[PDB]
Design a protein around this ligand. Structure first.
Ligand SMILES: Nc1ncnc2c1ncn2[C@@H]1O[C@H](COP(=O)(O)OP(=O)(O)OP(=O)(O)O)[C@@H](O)[C@H]1O
Ligand SMILES: [Zn+2]
Lengths: 303, 81, 225
């Protein structure tokens, strides 16, 4: 909870792929620190420019706003879905309040037409939260088939990030600019390094003092296996299985299952398959194959 | 073929983690410079944890093949069409 | 038709880039013709030889088996290799049967059953590459049919995504084509050779110019011409 110290200075880079030599040395041709009033004057002075946004020092200050880049009812449902998805994490471990999050994210946003950028005015968090759930956003985009969710880019969440300033072209050769969308007019409504406190917003982070050590163990979360998938595995084998009595996701792969044969084999046409069978998981796909000589049987995949 | 930006976007989508050498990639030397992945999370190809070697890309039959320098059995081969 | 005509003589070139003039006169030091046992013995006495398999006269007898070559510069594990080979077999059979039903006038089920019935595979001694020649034993067609099928095979290789399917070389379907005999050196000073597989132990099953039609084989050819 920094609270007291307010971030109004904007850190701008003037070259994509800037050499690392004259970047931390405060080169006037690559790095500048401007404010609200000077930015439009600089834009007026230089008709052609390429300006990207960044942070002063990620180690010291890493407080940003939640933003998305996509490349009326559709966006109306998209905003609600995104708010619910992030509120799930906010209530998961953040120690925050879901009601505060949904109140903060409600009807307070901006739009930009070039592929559009969304920044939430009254939502402040720390960049490690953004780096934590790029995978969650990707999973949400993949699982759902919503119009605007299908093209969400999670590659923008990284360290030393860059966000193109509205009205600044990628290159002088290109003729594509960001057209500002009403009712927002001032540049301060499109600055993801801008921080304020208006006795209505909310701040959330991991809040349990982790140094990006959240992943403790990802035990292949296909533990719906209670009777859905494991019964499918027992369905492909017509003959009875004896080790089926007690199974768990912990011993899901390590145990060599031994079955009994009274009718000829299911996967192939052989006799009793003396070497025990075995199971593996890859890319969320269940794989079944025979130990010893795998060429004496057939590998079967179950989604 | 497709634009180089689209292919790079697909490659960066395949790799969940970020690339710290993204700016060095170009349309003429995208098969020689090794790629280093910031290993905060396991790579999507093979889980393991925090590989200690860079990756590389090859162009064949209109597809991009991702292969890891060193022992080939460590990381699974991936093809982007 | 062919009826009695069943090829059993193996025509072989002993040197890549054979002179054109020498071939027309059957030069002994570049051109030979054996049987199966004669070829096996000739390879046995001389393990340093370099032999290629090709036809002699394409205007009189042009009946060959279906053959494919796969070469990928990436090692694979056992289970992934097995899954890839199964998918490759299924997709190749589907594509070939579709072409046979569309442009040749054959029957889809017979072609696909004949192709999945018997097939032979090889392997390379290289520890970093996956290369193999696959020959379908019970399917027969003319060379021009394969030349026509080249476009469909190229389209299938471009469209697919399996590591083995993307490595199909369609350049082998050319006039006056040659194929390397298994167990025989490619370069005079290279130790990389091909090896057989446990299901098949005879060389007769590894040559695409050997024709012997039993009751389980299928034959088809182009009908538009
Ligand atoms: N480390 C990285 N830094 C920046 N972009 C990266 C990185 N890794 C992968 N990428 C991808 O490369 C793409 C190239 O960025 P670029 O600025 O050209 O995109 P754009 O579609 O024009 O975006 P915008 O809508 O923000 O103007 C990014 O959109 C992103 O998907
Ligand atoms: Zn890996």
């Amino acid at each position: 909870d920094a609270a007291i110290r307010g971030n109004d200075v904007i850190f701008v880079l003037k070259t994509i792929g800037v050499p690392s030599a004259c970047r931390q040395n405060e080169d006037p041709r690559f790095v500048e620190a401007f404010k609200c009033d000077e930015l439009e004057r600089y834009i007026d002075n230089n008709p052609e420019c390429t300006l990207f946004e960044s942070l002063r020092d990620e180690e010291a200050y890493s407080i940003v706003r939640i933003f998305m880049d996509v490349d009326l009812t559709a966006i109306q449902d998209f905003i609600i879905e995104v708010s619910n998805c992030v509120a799930r994490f906010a209530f998961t471990e953040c120690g925050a309040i879901h009601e505060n999050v949904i109140k903060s994210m409600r009807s307070n946003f901006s739009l930009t037409k070039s592929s559009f950028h969304i920044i939430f005015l009254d939502t402040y968090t720390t960049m490690d939260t953004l780096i934590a759930m790029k995978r969650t956003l990707l999973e949400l985009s993949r699982s759902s088939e919503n119009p605007l969710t299908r093209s969400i880019d999670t590659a923008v969440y990284r360290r030393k990030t860059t966000l193109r300033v509205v009205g600044t072209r990628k290159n002088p050769n290109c003729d594509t600019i960001h057209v500002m969308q009403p009712p927002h007019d001032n540049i301060e409504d499109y600055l993801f390094t801008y921080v304020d406190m208006n006795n209505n917003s909310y701040y959330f982070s991991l809040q349990r003092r982790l140094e990006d050590l959240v992943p403790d163990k990802l035990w292949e979360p296909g533990f719906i296996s209670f009777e859905d998938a494991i019964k499918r595995v027992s369905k492909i084998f017509i003959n009875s299985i004896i080790n089926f009595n007690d199974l768990d996701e912990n011993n899901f792969t390590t145990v060599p299952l031994v079955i009994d044969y009274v009718t000829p084999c299911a996967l192939c046409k052989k006799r009793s398959h003396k070497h025990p069978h075995q199971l593996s998981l890859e890319n969320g796909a269940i794989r079944i194959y025979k130990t010893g000589n795998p060429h004496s049987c057939k590998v079967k995949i179950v989604p």
